[PDB]
Symmetry: C12
């Protein structure tokens, strides 16, 4: 099962889960302060993930650092 | 399931999901402002993804940037 | 399932999906303007994809 | 599921699908003008593919350029 | 399913499918003129493929040319 | 199933498990003191893990 | 299923299929003339293949 | 199933199993004195493992030592 | 399904199939003259193969040449 | 199915199996004298293995020599 | 299923199979004389193998 | 299924199959004279193979010769 690693590079980063299904809305926003890490899966309820703010992101595809 | 990473390189990038099935229409357009990232799977409802605007994109096949 | 990445290098690139089944016709053509990207899977309804117009294209086999 | 990429290197290339089953006949011919690309799967209805005209062809086995 | 790529290097190459099952006979012969290509799977009906004429052939095992 | 290796590099590192399902809340926070290690899986109940505090972290994607 | 690639380097190469089962006999011999190619699978009916005559042969193990 | 190797580098190292399920508590603490090794799987009952004390640890992800 | 390639390096090579089951006896011996090749599978009826005479043998493990 | 190789580097090494299930206790201790080797699987009854004494240990993760 | 290759480098090497299950005892010890080889699988009845005596041993993890 | 290649390097090599199950006895001994080869699988009836005599042996793990 696929997952995303997000490390915040500043205060106030948001990681937002978008709902799986015919409809798409934000179901949760997790706040990260500078240096906090979130390792989040794709799930039965989450089929897309949006990241706002300067962040280091790893997935199976590789890395993107803000 | 396969997924795409999109990093917006300018304001107002749109990531659009196209419906799976006999019919094809846009079901959702997620706006991304500069530096924001979307990690989005293909799903039961989305079998094609369209990106408009300056974006850095990674898939299983590699990177596509501009 | 397998997918193709198409980036339009001109305006009006057509990504044309062809029907899975005994019959072969286009059921959808998605237009891409210069610099726009489509990542499109093979699916229950699409078993062949045609690209008309100048495009950078990636598949599992390469670019 | 296996697939073939065909890029036409001249006008009037034909990509022809041959029927799956005990009988073999052409069920469809798709025309490609110079520079047009066809990415076609093997399917429930297509077990062989014939290409006529100068074409660049990729499969899992590698490349043949006319 | 496994497949074979055949590129005809002269006019009048024949790609022949041999029947799967207790009995073995030719069920189809596809003629290829010079530069024409056939990508052909093994199937429920075809368990051996015969090539006659000058051909460049790729399989999973490699290339065989002349 | 997939797992994460967290080594605390300060006292009071919190490894926070978030609920699998429609709702997202923390159901458990495991505290790690400096030098202590937690190897934690994704499971039926945990679909996201947050680490608060300075930590060396390994996943399938790298450190 | 596994297959063998035989290219005849003389006239009258015989590719001989032997019966899968308790009994072992040839059920088919396919003749190849010089330069002709047979790509032949193992199947429900063929569990051993014999090549008589000079031939270039590829399998999963090499040439 | 995935497993962890722990080698104690001092007396009194504890390897603790945390319960799988909605609830999370310690169910067992195995003490390791210097040079002693535990190879421990994740299981139906254990979905997280905690190490306290100076240890050399190997997992699928690599080594972690001190 | 596993298989053995045998090429005879002299006249009179024998490739012998030993029966699968509680009992073990030779069920067939195939003769190979110099330069003849046998590609033989392990099967429902054959769980061991004996080769007598100077032969070049390939399996998944590699090569043995007499 | 995963397994551990233990070679004793002194007399009196013990390899101890810990029970699978909600409860954890030692179910068996196998003694190894210097140079004796134990190759032990994880099983329906054993989910953790403890080694006491100077030992060379290999698992899928690599080697630890006392 | 997984297997071990034992080559005896002295006379009287014992390859000892231990019972799969709740109980652990030896159910079989196969003696090897110098230079003799045993290739032995893990099975429904054997979940641990002990080698007593000087031996060259290969597993999936190496020698 | 896994298999072993044995090449006899002297007359009178024996390849012995040991029974699978709760009981262990020899069920078959195949004699190999010099240069003769046996390729033998593990099976429903054979879960250990013993070689006596000078032999070159290949398995999935590598080669063992003398
Ligand atoms: N509700 C959408 C979410 C989604 C996933 N991938 C997307 C790509 C573009 C737009 C929306 C999405 C779905 O499950 O299909
Ligand atoms: N509704 C279409 C969407 C699609 C996927 N790939 C395509 C390629 C071309 C055109 C449309 C598509 C389908 O599910 O099949
Ligand atoms: N309707 C055809 C479409 C197709 C796929 N691959 C092809 C190759 C050639 C011609 C047509 C096709 C089918 O599903 O089989
Ligand atoms: N109708 C044939 C088509 C075919 C596939 N591979 C071939 C090779 C040779 C000749 C015909 C074929 C079949 O399904 O079997
Ligand atoms: N009881 C929790 C244990 C757990 C696993 N990974 C975690 C990460 C953080 C907190 C707790 C956990 C569960 O099975 O899901
Ligand atoms: N309850 C959410 C937790 C979650 C997983 N990945 C996420 C990414 C973003 C936001 C929330 C999450 C879920 O199971 O889907
Ligand atoms: N009718 C034969 C065709 C065949 C496949 N491989 C062969 C090798 C030799 C001779 C015939 C064959 C079968 O299906 O088994
Ligand atoms: N009828 C035999 C054919 C065979 C396959 N491999 C062999 C090796 C040796 C001798 C005969 C064979 C069988 O199906 O088992
Ligand atoms: N009848 C035996 C044949 C066999 C396979 N591997 C062996 C190794 C040694 C001796 C005999 C065998 C069986 O099916 O098990
Ligand atoms: N009875 C425990 C044994 C165990 C496995 N891994 C562990 C890690 C730590 C403590 C105990 C264990 C179980 O089956 O889950
Ligand atoms: N009858 C034993 C044979 C065996 C396999 N591996 C062993 C190792 C040691 C002793 C005996 C064995 C069993 O099937 O389990
Ligand atoms: N009867 C034990 C044998 C065993 C396997 N691995 C072990 C490790 C240590 C001690 C005993 C064992 C079991 O099946 O589980």
């Amino acid at each position: 099962s696929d997952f995303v690693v997000i490390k915040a590079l500043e205060d106030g980063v948001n990681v937002i889960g978008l709902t799986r299904g015919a409809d798409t809305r934000f179901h949760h926003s997790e706040k990260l302060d500078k240096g906090e890490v979130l390792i989040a899966q794709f799930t039965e309820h989450t089929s897309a993930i949006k990241v706002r703010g300067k962040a280091y992101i790893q997935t199976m595809h590789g890395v993107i650092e803000s």
